[PDB]
Amino acid sequence: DQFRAIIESPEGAGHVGYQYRRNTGSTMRMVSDVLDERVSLWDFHCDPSGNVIQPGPNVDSRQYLQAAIDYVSSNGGGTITIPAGYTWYLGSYGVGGIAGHSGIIQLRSNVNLNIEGRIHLSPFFDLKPFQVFVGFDNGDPASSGNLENCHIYGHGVVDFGGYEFGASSQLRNGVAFGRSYNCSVTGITFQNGDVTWAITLGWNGYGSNCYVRKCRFINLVNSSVNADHSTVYVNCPYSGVESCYFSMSSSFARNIACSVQLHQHDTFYRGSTVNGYCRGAYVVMHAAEAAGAGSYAYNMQVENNIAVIYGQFVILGSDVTATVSGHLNDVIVSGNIVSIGERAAFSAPFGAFIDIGPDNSGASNVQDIQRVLVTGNSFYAPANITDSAAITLRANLNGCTFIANNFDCRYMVYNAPGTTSPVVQNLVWDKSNVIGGTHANQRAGQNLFDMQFASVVNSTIEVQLSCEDLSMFSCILFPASCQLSYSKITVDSAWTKSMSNTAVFEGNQQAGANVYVSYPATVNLTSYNTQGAVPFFSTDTNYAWVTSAYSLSINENLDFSPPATYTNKANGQLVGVGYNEIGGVRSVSVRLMLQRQV
Amino acid sequence: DQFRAIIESPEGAGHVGYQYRRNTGSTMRMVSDVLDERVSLWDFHCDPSGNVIQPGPNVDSRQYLQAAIDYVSSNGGGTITIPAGYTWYLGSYGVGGIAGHSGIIQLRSNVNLNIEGRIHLSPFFDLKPFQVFVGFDNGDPASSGNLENCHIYGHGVVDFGGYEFGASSQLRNGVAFGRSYNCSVTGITFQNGDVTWAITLGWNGYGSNCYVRKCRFINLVNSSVNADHSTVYVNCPYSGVESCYFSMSSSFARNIACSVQLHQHDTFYRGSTVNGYCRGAYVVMHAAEAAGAGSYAYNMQVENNIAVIYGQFVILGSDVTATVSGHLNDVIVSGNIVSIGERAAFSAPFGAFIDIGPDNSGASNVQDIQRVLVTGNSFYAPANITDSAAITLRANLNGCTFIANNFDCRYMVYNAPGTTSPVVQNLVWDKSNVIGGTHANQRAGQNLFDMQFASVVNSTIEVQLSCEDLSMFSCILFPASCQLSYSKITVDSAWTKSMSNTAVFEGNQQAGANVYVSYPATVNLTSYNTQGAVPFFSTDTNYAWVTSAYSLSINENLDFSPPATYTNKANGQLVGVGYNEIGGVRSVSVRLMLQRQV
Amino acid sequence: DQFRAIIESPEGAGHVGYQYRRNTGSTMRMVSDVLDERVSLWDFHCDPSGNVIQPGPNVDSRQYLQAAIDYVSSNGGGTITIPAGYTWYLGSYGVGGIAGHSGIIQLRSNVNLNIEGRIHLSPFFDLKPFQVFVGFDNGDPASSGNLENCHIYGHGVVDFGGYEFGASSQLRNGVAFGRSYNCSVTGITFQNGDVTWAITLGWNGYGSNCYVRKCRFINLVNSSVNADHSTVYVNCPYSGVESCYFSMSSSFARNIACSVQLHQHDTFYRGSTVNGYCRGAYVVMHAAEAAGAGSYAYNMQVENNIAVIYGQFVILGSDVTATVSGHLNDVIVSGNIVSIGERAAFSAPFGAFIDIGPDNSGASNVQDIQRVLVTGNSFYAPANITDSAAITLRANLNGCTFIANNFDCRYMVYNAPGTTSPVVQNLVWDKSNVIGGTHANQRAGQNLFDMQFASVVNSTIEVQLSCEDLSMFSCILFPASCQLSYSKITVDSAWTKSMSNTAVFEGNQQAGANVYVSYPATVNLTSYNTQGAVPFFSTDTNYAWVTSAYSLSINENLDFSPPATYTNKANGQLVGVGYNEIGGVRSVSVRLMLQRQV
């Protein structure tokens, strides 16, 4: 007997008996069986003789973490703890199937990581691409197997070491789950980098039930080299982001960074706070990514978020390839409170709550976006920020509905003249959208709704001001190049009495058979001489399209009154019947509500 | 001394000393004390001699799990881990108080289960009833004690083994918490079954603070035998479901399955995604379940959910027994984006966003439902689905308010003719509800708002179209059997110019003293011969109820104009004063806005 | 050799070898290394000889918990478990930097507490102040260092022992995180006390990323001595409360308790349920607390909560000190369903959904509150509760917008006469707010919108009733002392036909140049004798301000008709042109819609 030698060997714990709480009905086990119920990096962080190695800036922990993942996977899975109170440095690339993804660690199905300590990237990675955790098992994703049931969670940290990108063409990621099913990241802080993304869920539609919750993403763009950034990229359905925090402090992030991109159906972005980013969320169906879950992005939800951004909050898109056409529909944007941060006009991408953006090539005639509801959001831009819109409508739009929002910025609807000429269908701006007054007196030469489109059909614009802004050129203007048909355009009279122009139709498009319109105008009239009931007629003949008009002015006169209400005549005059108590030709200038078919 | 024998016995770990991290200020303990801080199924999964047994398809793990729960309960509670990397099969029924509930495992207060591995049901259960985890301690719930402080959580799985029900009368459940206080399920996947429910919280109002969060429920209906299904049943107050995922793929689920039923006050269903179900949520006060928390369901919230369903999204109800009357009030439905999945017309229960349903016996005259707010939701049904409504209003309704929703389906308000004749009070349809155009041109013979009721009082219907649909018979129709009083009914003129019928009152109900109405109509008028101010009068005498009317048509004429505005006469003609520049009898057909008291 | 003595000593576990699962590639460790991966109170709950002490009502566990926290902190952090199945009593105050805060336990950075058992306060604390867990390290917070990365979580309980406050001037707290960065409380129940707060996040703006989630707060006010209570106090930015439950049962809580106060920018309160409280949430920028995060509270969100309260749901405020001015802006209140619980009129603070409150001194002329959006909420008060308002507007207001809410209570807008005289700008009440009928017939002598202000500018009140209430004195009244300018005030005619007074302007303020108004009135008219087109004129001369008016009454007559539409004359009469088929002086009383500039 050297029981003593056994006890001191690595098998010693397998010889020391244990029964839970001295319970005679419990299993008769050995200490090693109970200790085997859990597993940490420490169980693999050793030299070839089995001696534990201390982590630190001059130790590459990657091979030890991989060994731990590879082993737990072999037993059907479990959860490996990355211990608290230590920083574990990664200092070399992985090998095999993840090498094509500049992968550091390969994730494996059913193997969870409980990250309590800190994972840091060593300077080996400075100026290089990297993707810290990769779930593909093959360089070519199309030939990759899946990652299932893989969760990363804890109070720990992933720190990208502050290193800048070496070249704009490089990619960097934190967690690339691959073709991912029931995978998640919960509680982790991702910080201190220059990366493309922090987490990507799914791969071109392949994946399901992937989620990012209660995570923090802090200072993840730091250079002019970085081409682009979207902090969480959701590229599988039935997946989303909730209750996260996103913050950036570099100037470059104001111009290139987006918090989330939702690229597949039944995805969501909720209850998060964003600060310092260019963009809130892209909601898009890219044809080039339609392989796993179909050609439609539908059931897309952006809800109850708080954002301070420099560019656009939600960007809608869809596009085509030679062989696939992408479609976007059935979207809700609700409950968000968003502002454009303090900045000079035009110093960052054009500020907007909703942007209908062109494709990556800049095409504006490929999109099929419809059945979008934008409701119960607030938006605010400071008064100096000329380039701020409720919606920048820069590409073809097949429908978008606004109800009960509060927009307080320079423009309501905008698209630049002399740029794209979008085809617009089913734009619905309900009268319950409240138009703020922060930009009152700043709108010289500007149209509040600047309808710079090829055409508008089946649309509703119900303008309601809630304060005066006599600087604006018009509440709404259509250039002559914009066709307008089967539409309803109204300007409420409140706060408009002193406006020269309320609604402007540069091609007289309001005359159209199925155009329904009402807006204030000032009209000069003259009556016949007759005592008693007497007609008054407009001097100008521009009113052939008017079905009725009524007075918005008081009558200062005792001896006569103009008509309360007017119709038209074939020559384009208005006509109504007033009353001369005493006879005489009368001449008056009156403010009328002009109406056509309403 | 055989210290050696002691060390190798089950008491051995109780003789090996330990002090945390060699800290001289730490407790001097033994290894067994530290190991006793945690507990797993392995500590009870043993034969009568204490030898561990491996789980698997031919091992019934139920008695061992029960022993573990029973023991931990005896020490005031704790958390038992069901280890990862193993499947633990259940293969027999429990005994005692849960036997009346076809119970497998009895839950006990303060004893949590951390389910990391998989729990599977063995074929013993095929064609039989079962309720996997039961929190009652008595066959009769009325005599049951409570379950408190019992949480089930982890990354693990409950798999129901795919077995079909043996008979429609059978019940099956996953987690029946019983009379449950501060109990929860978090993170678990429930899959592969034919069950009635996955989780039930509470028992006829008894319970509090019970929640289902971040769970998945997948393929839990699979046969024509299954009578009914509601995945999470909330039958105690201050309780709810959030951030879950629900999916079904069988045809039968499209016809019988609901994701959630909320049956008591201060309950919620939020931030979840549903696919493949008949129904989203029932929100109901069943008198037969009013014992623990009173006769009122109030503070009911369904918010920010994503759903593809085949029948109805939210179903409202209340009913009575011989001795109790149930009441439903103070409900909010908001932020939801819901569609009816691709299906033939009438191939599944009638598609609806809100259904006011009859009781289980089919009675429509027992309900007391009021103070419901439906706001900021989207709803869409494909164009072929005739049986799609914003609201199917099939039983008595004491109030429901719609504001700022987007409904894009066949009907807005519907109830079938020749079925129930509901009594309707306080139905409020605000003008900010946007009516979509997906079903344009499909509505031959149909009324968009088909008011097939006994009576309507204290209601508001403000119809606003946003595109043309000249196929419809009318925007809104009241049959002569429907009384209408103290109500406001308006049809906006936009997109209505070519409609023969806009609003239709088959019993001339718009004449009522306290009916306030406006809608377009085409009216033929004829004038007197007189040069100058001249009256025009309607040919028909159907307008005794009209307080004013105004022109919606242009005047093609030079030599005269009809009145811009009209009143009536006792004989039912309209009359207004136009103008003849030259004399002559005039005859015109004009589109007017008819108004009564507005 | 006494290997035996080594094995039985506290170093024994450090001599027993272990290799994970017998894996030859795993680290060769000792049992003590694996046991050192975790830590509990048991590792410090010992006498000076190292013998474990059992917790209980006669053991003060404070020094042992502190030793554990102090030690784990020294190794860079980790998580200490407070074991399940035991109650751990605290029975003395802490010492050092927390003594000035009546502190019991000092929290330390990176040291988490996993509270599974129960923490109770011993009677030592009866009638005394206490703050159970404190994160400051100094008596003076301005000289305190920070607390970082400190999370408290588990299924456990903090029980305050039921003790009443000894004096109103005392303070009590559960968790005072101090100057707190990335700190949280998750899952804990706080119960059975008389305290000021349960959790405070941050200190006068210092802090970030602090959160309270899935916690319960039960019966935390119990005496008339308690001065005030706010259950969670958020005093750092990028921080909030979600998915919590709050309940009180004492009468005193109905009068003094608030669930949440949000005091810094980018903070949120969501998805929670409140019962038995006076107040939901204060949303305020207190100048006296502006040191760490600036003088502005902006991006404040209160969303998707369920509440039964006795006073006010959301209270807005801002104030000044000698040297700082606080500002409140960019607030959203949405998706909440709130009611005033059953109580007598005036038996608790005045019931309101939104209150614009004076400062703590009662000043109403210091506030700078603007860009608030209140949308898609429900509110209900029982019919007897006279003191219930959608908004009690008691201090200066620079803007608040209401869209698509359902308010069912006594008043819509209220402020008491003979109290404060607020200056109001940019109050926007959209026509999509639905006014309920619960208080119909209770409003004798009352104005639904009682505009008891110094002045109103740039505001919109669009009144729409949905049932009759002929008890009210007026839908909206402005006293002569209230100036009114650049505003839009409309009363829809539905349900108003029998009202003597609809809108009332006691100083004839509707005459103002930039006041835009429309409301029903009854007007007596008389015509001239003339056969044919004939003028009708109002008897009264009160209509100099009317731009147009139109009939809301039918014409019972055959031989004549009054004008459909009217304008005015300089003498203040209305005039229109009707028609006498037969001649004669006519005299009629008609209901008109009076309009000014709309």
mmCIF file of C-alpha atoms in Angstrom, chain A residues 487-569:
data_model
loop_
_atom_site.group_PDB
_atom_site.id
_atom_site.type_symbol
_atom_site.label_atom_id
_atom_site.label_comp_id
_atom_site.label_asym_id
_atom_site.label_seq_id
_atom_site.Cartn_x
_atom_site.Cartn_y
_atom_site.Cartn_z
ATOM 1 C CA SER A 487 -54.134 61.064 -53.168
ATOM 2 C CA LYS A 488 -55.286 63.207 -50.284
ATOM 3 C CA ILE A 489 -53.364 66.349 -49.393
ATOM 4 C CA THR A 490 -54.645 68.700 -46.695
ATOM 5 C CA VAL A 491 -53.234 71.662 -44.816
ATOM 6 C CA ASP A 492 -55.084 72.529 -41.583
ATOM 7 C CA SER A 493 -55.535 76.245 -41.283
ATOM 8 C CA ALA A 494 -54.278 76.683 -37.695
ATOM 9 C CA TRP A 495 -51.160 78.919 -37.580
ATOM 10 C CA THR A 496 -51.325 79.481 -41.359
ATOM 11 C CA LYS A 497 -53.201 82.809 -41.674
ATOM 12 C CA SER A 498 -50.144 84.830 -42.517
ATOM 13 C CA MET A 499 -48.494 82.275 -44.882
ATOM 14 C CA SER A 500 -48.221 83.355 -48.549
ATOM 15 C CA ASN A 501 -47.964 79.754 -49.627
ATOM 16 C CA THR A 502 -49.481 76.804 -47.802
ATOM 17 C CA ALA A 503 -49.681 74.018 -50.430
ATOM 18 C CA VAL A 504 -47.896 74.447 -53.753
ATOM 19 C CA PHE A 505 -48.474 72.345 -56.839
ATOM 20 C CA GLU A 506 -45.952 73.575 -59.430
ATOM 21 C CA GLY A 507 -47.591 71.576 -62.143
ATOM 22 C CA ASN A 508 -51.129 72.294 -61.043
ATOM 23 C CA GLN A 509 -51.386 68.612 -60.045
ATOM 24 C CA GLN A 510 -54.155 69.310 -57.573
ATOM 25 C CA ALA A 511 -56.504 69.483 -60.616
ATOM 26 C CA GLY A 512 -56.332 65.767 -61.062
ATOM 27 C CA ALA A 513 -59.617 63.799 -61.177
ATOM 28 C CA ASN A 514 -58.809 61.710 -58.095
ATOM 29 C CA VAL A 515 -56.847 64.285 -56.117
ATOM 30 C CA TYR A 516 -58.552 65.307 -52.903
ATOM 31 C CA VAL A 517 -57.068 68.536 -51.412
ATOM 32 C CA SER A 518 -57.789 71.393 -49.078
ATOM 33 C CA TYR A 519 -55.569 74.388 -48.099
ATOM 34 C CA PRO A 520 -55.782 78.129 -47.248
ATOM 35 C CA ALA A 521 -55.322 80.798 -49.850
ATOM 36 C CA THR A 522 -55.910 84.557 -50.036
ATOM 37 C CA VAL A 523 -58.368 85.535 -52.795
ATOM 38 C CA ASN A 524 -59.490 88.926 -54.124
ATOM 39 C CA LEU A 525 -63.136 89.205 -54.990
ATOM 40 C CA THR A 526 -65.412 91.805 -56.574
ATOM 41 C CA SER A 527 -69.259 91.948 -56.457
ATOM 42 C CA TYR A 528 -71.940 93.215 -58.721
ATOM 43 C CA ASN A 529 -73.703 96.520 -57.841
ATOM 44 C CA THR A 530 -77.078 95.002 -56.915
ATOM 45 C CA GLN A 531 -78.764 95.764 -53.571
ATOM 46 C CA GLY A 532 -79.709 92.568 -51.693
ATOM 47 C CA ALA A 533 -78.501 89.050 -52.471
ATOM 48 C CA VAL A 534 -75.484 89.705 -54.755
ATOM 49 C CA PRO A 535 -72.738 87.582 -56.327
ATOM 50 C CA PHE A 536 -69.080 88.007 -55.581
ATOM 51 C CA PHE A 537 -66.500 86.669 -58.043
ATOM 52 C CA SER A 538 -62.770 86.089 -57.765
ATOM 53 C CA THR A 539 -60.554 88.395 -59.860
ATOM 54 C CA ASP A 540 -58.203 85.528 -60.745
ATOM 55 C CA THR A 541 -59.212 82.551 -62.812
ATOM 56 C CA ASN A 542 -56.949 79.913 -61.253
ATOM 57 C CA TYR A 543 -59.740 78.007 -59.418
ATOM 58 C CA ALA A 544 -61.237 75.627 -62.063
ATOM 59 C CA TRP A 545 -60.329 72.722 -59.770
ATOM 60 C CA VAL A 546 -62.086 74.023 -56.610
ATOM 61 C CA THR A 547 -65.276 72.240 -55.558
ATOM 62 C CA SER A 548 -66.002 74.550 -52.647
ATOM 63 C CA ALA A 549 -64.361 77.245 -50.533
ATOM 64 C CA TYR A 550 -65.289 78.969 -47.323
ATOM 65 C CA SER A 551 -64.288 82.089 -45.437
ATOM 66 C CA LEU A 552 -61.456 82.110 -42.907
ATOM 67 C CA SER A 553 -61.663 85.941 -42.402
ATOM 68 C CA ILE A 554 -63.929 88.232 -40.492
ATOM 69 C CA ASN A 555 -66.089 90.856 -42.304
ATOM 70 C CA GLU A 556 -65.161 94.320 -41.034
ATOM 71 C CA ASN A 557 -68.130 95.828 -42.935
ATOM 72 C CA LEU A 558 -71.620 96.868 -41.801
ATOM 73 C CA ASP A 559 -73.251 97.620 -45.137
ATOM 74 C CA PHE A 560 -72.505 94.270 -46.821
ATOM 75 C CA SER A 561 -71.144 90.837 -46.332
ATOM 76 C CA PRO A 562 -69.219 88.566 -48.751
ATOM 77 C CA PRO A 563 -70.366 84.949 -49.197
ATOM 78 C CA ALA A 564 -69.563 82.574 -46.393
ATOM 79 C CA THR A 565 -69.110 79.908 -49.083
ATOM 80 C CA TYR A 566 -68.081 79.665 -52.725
ATOM 81 C CA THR A 567 -68.212 77.362 -55.648
ATOM 82 C CA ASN A 568 -66.576 77.742 -59.073
ATOM 83 C CA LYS A 569 -67.337 78.522 -62.712
#
